[PDB]
Amino acid sequence: VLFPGDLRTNLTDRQLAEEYLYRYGYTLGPALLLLQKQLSLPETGELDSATLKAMRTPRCGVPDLGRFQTFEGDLKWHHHNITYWIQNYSEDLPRAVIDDAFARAFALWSAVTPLTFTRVYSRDADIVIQFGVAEHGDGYPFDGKDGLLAHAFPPGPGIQGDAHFDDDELWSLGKGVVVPTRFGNADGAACHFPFIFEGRSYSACTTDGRSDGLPWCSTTANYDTDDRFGFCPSERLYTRDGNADGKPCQFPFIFQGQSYSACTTDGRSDGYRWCATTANYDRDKLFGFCPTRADSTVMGGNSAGELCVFPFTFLGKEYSTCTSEGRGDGRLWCATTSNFDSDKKWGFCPDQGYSLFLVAAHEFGHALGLDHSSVPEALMYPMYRFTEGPPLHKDDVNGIRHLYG
Template identity: 55%
Template sequence: MSVLTALFVVGILCVRSHCAPTPQKTPLSIIFPGEIRSNMSDVEMAEKYLHNFGYLALEQGSDSHVSIRKALAHMQRKLGLHETGDLDQETMDAMRAPRCGVPDIGNFNTFEGELKWDHNDITYRVQNYSPDLDPEVIDDAFVRAFDVWSQVTPLTFTRIYNGVPDIDILFGSDNHGDPYPFDGKDGLLAHAYPPGPGVQGDAHFDDDEFWTLGTGVVVKTRFGNADGALCNFPFIFESQSYSTCTSAGRSDGLPWCGTTSNYDQDKKYGFCPSEYTAVIGGNAQGDPCVFPFTFMDNTYDSCTSEGRGDRKLWCATTSSYDRDRKWGFCPDRGYSLFLVAAHEFGHALGLEHSDIQDALMYPMYKYISDFQLHSDDVQGIQYLYGPKQGPGPKPPGPTKKPSTTTTKKPTTTTTTASTTTTTASIDPVDPTQDACNVKVFDAIAELQGDLHFFKDGLYWKVPAKSQGPPKAPLRIADTWPALPDNIDTAFQDPATKKIFFFAGRKFWQYTGSSVLGPRGIEKLGLDKDVQAVMGAIPRNNGKVLLFNGEKYWRMDVKAQTVDKDYPKNTDEEFAGVPTDFHDVFLYEGKYHFCQDRFFWRMTWRKQVDRVGYIKYDLLRCPEH
């Protein structure tokens, strides 16, 4: 048996250009600023691949040439390719394909015992979420992925929120806490460990990937005439096909999309929020595409592959690439979280990779719109756990969520060095504590998709879709036991999902329930005269802006140091907001500067588009 992840084909977007590009005998290919291209030869890449996935170690010998030929033949046989022993084009294409990070031969480590669970009710916990999808969409993808296996076995899957689960699920990037780092966008998509204690059974997903349902970014439109419907990609406009948001047909440059497959026919559309047009990679630090933009004196109002030998879609993040040379890749079809999760959960249940290309447990990724579990996968999982009792299996589809239980345990604290892991029992808080009676909050931050309001040891959560004020508060100490009662600001890094809290000259870093700190902000490179960090705006690509009144810094989250050429003056970059603010935070893709009872909302283009009441517009308290 085997693991998922396979060949991915990105549809080429038909772009509409105001000026036809100059005809060329060969495709134009330029080096974009900030782009790193590998100098590794095909042979070097092949050797690394064969070693990483367990083939080369099996064929070690005195003659390296013969050893590599044997390893290549073994790999070709294992992956269902033509067995030649040569590094041919089919083999190179397979090596470049997105795939699961679990080795094809052997496992990450040598684990003792039979690699299957000794019980049928498997528990799981979701540690964090990807910013690419709403949490409820991610939860549903995991539920459906588990159901793939419960349909054909006696296994059941129960989500828990406290205690120790069998399967811990997390999103992380690069070095994410285990010995097997991810490799950035594309390449390795995810990995999982076989059943057992500790890290065994856990599933990790690369947060540098673009996670979707397999058919492109899930964009919730605003305004327009489609009542907030999702974009439908691709869609037809003026007889041309668009696979991303576009400004075609508009003189104001606002990105929009069709919400049916044919705008020309149905006339249904909505506007795309800026966070859905943010670029990936490049040198623009996650800024949104700007349409139209100029490239080599031609004008484009959609993402284009012009100038790229690899035909990847990109856009400029200013109106003129020729002048500013700011750019990034456009979101593509992405990878189906459901399919990748179903594959990884197969590993977490004890399955290895399959050599059948249509099997779920085949190592390479391939999108399947009407997925059904292959007989090879069924035979493998039933060998471990037996068949499902009762009626025969039916093809998995939309399912009801498995029952969820909350397991309460006594408070336990384990401390090693400066890292603390805590499971805390939560006592009820007086429900009469009304957030609408608070005049000024200590801090406001968007964490895990919800807006959090902090005050004197308590916090209130306002979900994104909430229509009214928050209910009873929660205690900071119950959720983040290491923190003081009063904090100055907080933010969550979009890439790692780590949450940072600042209070005075100290800061704390939470990863799930584990905490690092407190540490002094001087460790970040902030001046000794900085007494507090009063606001934080996380950016893509691992950067965050830290504010202290008249000054602000840009910090690299991974290195945890501020960048050179900082601090800078707040009023020069963020004109139009008060400099005596007491908090700054990012919410729904826009910057919010708070002073007393009011907030100034600023777009990514640094334009103030609203001044509102914190109490009524953010807390959603009734006006009376």
């Protein structure tokens, strides 16, 4: 029926083209014609449906023509060992997955050149890596969800060689929120969203098929045929850090003489959720931090930030997984209370997100001196499109090789 707080203000075709052609350095037919060449679209010189479809797809924020500013130097590194510093992390992913995605993105390039990359921990690095949100320190602000996904600067001193990723995007490995599991039979392997269990398709973790309320997930596309799974982040299964050694929270638990039935911040200013791992913290003084559940935290709607509540009632019916019921755009949402028919509290469920790996490899191409390829399947192509294979293409290789070795 109706979804309040769902805002539709996405720009019209003309405003979009005007901004896009301005932002990526093209500035209408002459400009459009250039854009179609850069992207290898039919060169019609008209704002056609293929051109609009492209302006509407997520891409890199680095201009296709022109540069961000005047840059110092010949824009090619002149020492082979390049240093990089990861100054901050996105919370959408396990810090280790982030470290690894970047390491792998760098490896695609050290592979076909004499360069090598070594992780460092100071602003000293040749390449400083950072997650930022809108205005983030350099005068080239990001645009909120889905516009440009990131950007980087050519080789050089200062901000040059740096790479920035827009944390308004859901960062992942491109196939749904990255959720490493605990205790399944899957060795800690990550959840495979979407997964099939007893029929149904799940795009998040569920507690159904269980009675203990532990959210789990298949680690393959079909659990029914594979029997491989693991448990998702839950304070009912484990806790992190603290002194409880990982033991699950116990509800309820006494603290400051007060009885809690959920994690809490009382006693902290850093909004971190924690809980006692025994029925009484004052007596036993054992506690741990409640892990965060990214697979089912909604975006947008009138409850951004909150968790899907399953099952939830929609049109008298019961839903136990994210749904697209009630929508014509097929997108997934969930209610953030058990009854949506009365509460109307909802949000959109996490999507595939953007591969931190692919985007980083693309941006590192810039931090090394490369520009945009006009070859659709090449890594240095401007637009984002998720693919499973190795991403360096012949064109990327010819380009990085023209600069190094």
